[PDB]
Amino acid sequence: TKGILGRKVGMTQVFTENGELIPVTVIEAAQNVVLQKKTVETDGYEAVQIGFEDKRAILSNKPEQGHVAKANTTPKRFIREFRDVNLDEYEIGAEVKVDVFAEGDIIDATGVSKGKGFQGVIKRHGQSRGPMAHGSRYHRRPGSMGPVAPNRVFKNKLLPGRMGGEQITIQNLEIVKVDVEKNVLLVKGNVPGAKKALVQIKTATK
Amino acid sequence: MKVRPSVKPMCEKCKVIRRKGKVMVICENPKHKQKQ
Amino acid sequence: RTTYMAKPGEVERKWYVIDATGVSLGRLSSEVASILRGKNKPQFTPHIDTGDFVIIINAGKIGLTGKKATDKIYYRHSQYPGGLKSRTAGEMRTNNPEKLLELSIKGMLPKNSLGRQLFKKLHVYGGSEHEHAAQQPEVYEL
Amino acid sequence: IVIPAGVTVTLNGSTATVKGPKGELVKEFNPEITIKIEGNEINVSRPTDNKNHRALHGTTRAILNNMVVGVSEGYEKKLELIGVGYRAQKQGDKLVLNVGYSHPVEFVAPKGVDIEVPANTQVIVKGYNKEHVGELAANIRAVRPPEPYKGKGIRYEGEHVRRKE
RNA sequence: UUGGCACCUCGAUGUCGGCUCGUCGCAUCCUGGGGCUGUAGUCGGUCCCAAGGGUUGGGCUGUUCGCCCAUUAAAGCGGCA
RNA sequence: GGAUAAACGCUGAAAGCAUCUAAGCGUGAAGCCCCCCUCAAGAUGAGAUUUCCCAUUUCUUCGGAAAGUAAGAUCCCUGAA
Ligand SMILES: [K+]
Ligand SMILES: [Mg+2]
Ligand SMILES: [Mg+2]
Ligand SMILES: [Mg+2]
Ligand SMILES: [Mg+2]
Ligand SMILES: [Mg+2]
Ligand SMILES: [Mg+2]
Ligand SMILES: [Mg+2]
Ligand SMILES: [Mg+2]
Ligand SMILES: [Zn+2]
């Protein structure tokens, strides 16, 4: 099992040797470093703490500076643990390049979906609009809360609210291309999040 | 199986028994398998 | 006129250890509840916690007579529709017996702010070992 | 209650062991029963003659006797295959059956059990633990148990298959 | 369900059908497991366990129901004023 | 995967046989607990790991206080993913 963190650069499409055409998301995964190595005896769970981007020491702070100095590298912007991963690899301070993967290798991409604001039910939860004619004054409203008997409405009655920002994993995506010079990884299809968003790519659980 | 409150022998080879707190009859004839 | 009412801190409060091996859930819990409420002491005052602190070990060996291991069913509800989750007393004895004795004793304590405060004085272990040796506790026999 | 040559019976409370030429059998019985020992013979008794103790007296005797007969002579169970194409084989110590499915079914005989192929239409289980012998014979029969209309399938050799039109 | 009673409500507890949203039970329609078969096989009948998910779109009618066309793995029965 | 329903069985008595059960073993469902996704320590049971700042001065008879700071964070400002 093997993993990185990256930024979403965008989408494009690539022709394979068959001449088939394949959309791809681009992930730029530079400056990945191992910062801490958690254990069952120190913590209770085995995991590897990766930090992804270099940033400035005035945007940083002295705690983060200490934690990265224990790794002998710069402060980082995104820091994340990966589990179900072997610890005999991943020596502290080590740099963690995209070359750990390979073409056709197969992954789960985990990221924080895009932000739609306060939304209604038919967009958010997929409900149906009521008629727009024949006398209707019910178009995009949510429907009955429920029956009378409870004197209350049940939980998980679905209503307007803030739509996105939720964490999402997409599974069984395919890695098309690896470019260690550009620190670039190509993924068939899509991933969650806007441009410049953090993506957590890892070997698929299945 | 025939599930019935009226579990009684249907021939002479039928044999009443008590499996898992329930009255069954077993016979060579599979039809006679009764449960209560 | 004049009869003694205790005060918080007025009474010494001890730390007891019980081997729960073979004893029936309910009988052990009934003895523990009274210890925690403080009815073994004549300093008892109903609105004050005079009771003692209590430890229980070998809770995974707690006795369950009959078919209660399979037929006594604990239930939880998530307050969601169909959010009912059941689990058997024997399964709980195996995996999470601490929660089992907690559930037994909670229903046997009073249902108040005090009783909630008393539940905190209980420390349960399915094993033979506990963390509370610093308090140097005494054995209690039922 | 014979104890033939080579057999050694040992006891510790509810536990017990019996060793012999063909294997070791460590088992338990409930303690309420009572044991008495002679060099060739070991008897059992019940103190109170209530329901459970009656149930357990003959049970424990029979199970001891099974342990003894197993270490001393073992047990055999014979299964015969009936049907064209129904084929048996062992790739060494692993049974394989080819019985009209779109695949074969393989088995492994666990510690104390053994298979034998005296012919393609015949397989035999052998052991010193009667329980395991019968269980593996039963599971091997479970793959294509006999249908009535022809008898096609595995069966114990002395089994009274019922047939129909 | 048809009914019976007339116990709350007549200083107001709004009705059928549909739309939106569903949720629950199991006496399970489909899928799943199994016993008996007057079960050759295909298909089926009946019965037990199972409520996980799923359980269509139109013509006539205000209509529920129902008839029809065409599909479906299936086009479930019911409770929640 | 683990444990089960219905069911099939092994061994085995009670009841010299028989019996899937009584003690004891195995198989065994789309179901149960897990596996997969998400939220989650206000989980007052408030958890854990890593790193950072330090033990100031006034007072007050004690408790205890306020009054400037550190690590850090914000008021304010340019803004959007
Ligand atoms: K009225
Ligand atoms: Mg619509
Ligand atoms: Mg309008
Ligand atoms: Mg009024
Ligand atoms: Mg009103
Ligand atoms: Mg049913
Ligand atoms: Mg019309
Ligand atoms: Mg119409
Ligand atoms: Mg199983
Ligand atoms: Zn019969």
Q: Which residues touch D79 (CB under 8 Å, ≥6 apart)? A: D122, D123, D124, D125, D137, D140, D141, D154, D155, D156, D157
CA dist., res. C80 & res. A156, Å (int): 7
DSSP A51: E
CA dist., res. C119 & res. C28, Å (int): 15
Whether D143 and D95 share a structural domain: yes
Q: Buried b / exposed e across A37-53, counting CB within 10 Å, b at 16+? A: bbeeeeeeebbbbbbbb
User: Considering Cα of D150, then D154, then D158, then D162, what sign does the dihedral take?
Assistant: negative
Residue A157, SS3 per DSSP? coil
CA dist., res. A167 & res. C1, Å (int): 67
Residue A157 Cα, gap to closest chain C Cα (Å): 10
Q: Note whether A168 and A192 are within 8 A (CB).
A: yes
Q: Which of A50, A29, A37, A132 is nearest to A88 (CA)?
A: A37
Count of pairs with CB atoms under 8 A, one residue in A, one in C: 7
Answer yes or no: is D19 within a domain. Answer: yes
Please state at what angle helix D51-73 crosses helix D130-141, rounded to 10 degrees. Answer: 80
Whether D37 and D79 share a structural domain: no
Whether D81 and D148 share a structural domain: yes
CA dist., res. A189 & res. D37, Å (int): 78
Q: Which residue has the tokens 């934690």?
A: A67
C136 conformational bin, left if phi > 0, alpha if psi -120 to 50, beta if neither: left
Q: Which of C128, C117, C106, C100 is nearest to C13 (CA)?
A: C117
Task: Outline where A9-162 has alpha helix (H).
Answer: 62-69, 121-124
Q: Which residue has the tokens 């995974």?
A: C60
Q: Note whether C23 and C60 are within 8 A (CB).
A: no
CA angle A169, A174, A178 (to 5 degrees): 110
Whether D93 and D142 share a structural domain: yes
Q: How far is the CA of A165 from the centre of ligand 2 (A)?
A: 28
The residue from D73, D98, D113 where one domain ends is D73
Q: Which of A166, A167, A171 is nearest to A202 (CA)?
A: A171
Answer yes or no: is D160 within a domain. Answer: no
Distances (CA, A) of D89 to C21, D83, D94, D153, D158: 53, 15, 8, 16, 22
| Interface check A118 vs C, CB under 8 A | no
Q: Identify which ligand lies nearest to the alpha carbon of A130.
A: 2
Whether D90 and D147 share a structural domain: yes
Please tell me the number of Cα atoms within 13 Å of B5 on its side-chain side. 0
Residue C96 Cα, gap to closest chain A Cα (Å): 19
The total of structural domains in chain D comes to 2
A95 token code pair = 């740099």
Whether D58 and D86 share a structural domain: no
CA dist., res. A8 & res. A5, Å (int): 10
Whether D81 and D150 share a structural domain: yes
Q: Which of D16, D17, D21, D26 is nearest to D6 (CA)?
A: D21
CA of A111 to C1' of F21 (A): 56
Q: Which of A2, A4, A1 is nearest to A191 (CA)?
A: A4
State the Cα torsion A77-A83-A88-A89 to the nearest 10°: -50
Q: How far does CA A202 lie from the centroid of its chain? A: 10
Q: Note whether A67 and A45 are within 8 A (CB).
A: no
Around Cβ C20, how many Cβ atoms within 10 Å?
24
Residues at the strand E interface (Cβ < 7 Å)? A 127-128, 130-131, 138, 141-144, 146-150, 154, 156-158; B 1-3, 29-31, 33; C 81-82; D 148-149, 164-165
The residue from D50, D73, D96 where one domain ends is D73
Q: Note whether A202 and A82 are within 8 A (CB).
A: yes
CA dist., res. A123 & res. A9, Å (int): 27
Please state at what angle helix C97-106 crosses helix C25-37, rounded to 10 degrees. Answer: 60
Residue A29 Cα, gap to closest chain C Cα (Å): 42
Answer yes or no: is D24 within a domain. Answer: yes
Annotate C59-123 with DSSP letters as a single string: GGG-B--TTHHHH-EEEEE-SSTT-EEEEEHHHHHHH-HHHHHHHHHHTTS-SSHHHHHHHTTEE
Whether D89 and D142 share a structural domain: yes
Answer yes or no: is D14 within a domain. Answer: yes
CA of D72 to C1' of E72 (A): 65
Q: Note whether D16 and D4 are within 8 A (CB).
A: no
Whether D97 and D130 share a structural domain: yes
The residue from D57, D73, D89 where one domain ends is D73
Q: Note whether C55 and C18 are within 8 A (CB).
A: yes
Helix (H) or strand (E) holding D141: helix D130-141
Protein footprint on strand E: which nucleotides are under 7 Å from a CB? 19-25, 34-40, 47-48, 52, 80-81
CA closest to C80 among chain A residues: A155
Helix (H) or strand (E) holding D59: helix D51-73
Q: How far does CA D12 lie from the centroid of its chain? A: 25
CA dist., res. A167 & res. A162, Å (int): 14
Answer yes or no: is D2 within a domain. Answer: no
CA-based Rg of chain B, rounded to a whole angstrom?
9
β-bridge partners, A6: A199
Q: Which of A92, A91, A61, A90 is nearest to A75 (CA)?
A: A61
C26 token code pair = 């309910």
Answer yes or no: is D66 within a domain. Answer: yes
| Interface check A152 vs C, CB under 8 A | no
Q: Which residue has the tokens 């003895």?
A: C31
CATH number, domain of D22, equals 3.90.930.12
Range of the domain at D147: 75-155
Question: One-letter amino acid identity for D30?
Answer: N
- Best of A154, A157, A158 to disrupt the C interface (most C CBs within 10 Å) is A154
With an 8 Å Cβ cutoff, are A156 and C79 in contact? no
Sort A142 into a burial class: Cβ within 10 Å, 0-12 / 13-18 / 19+: middle
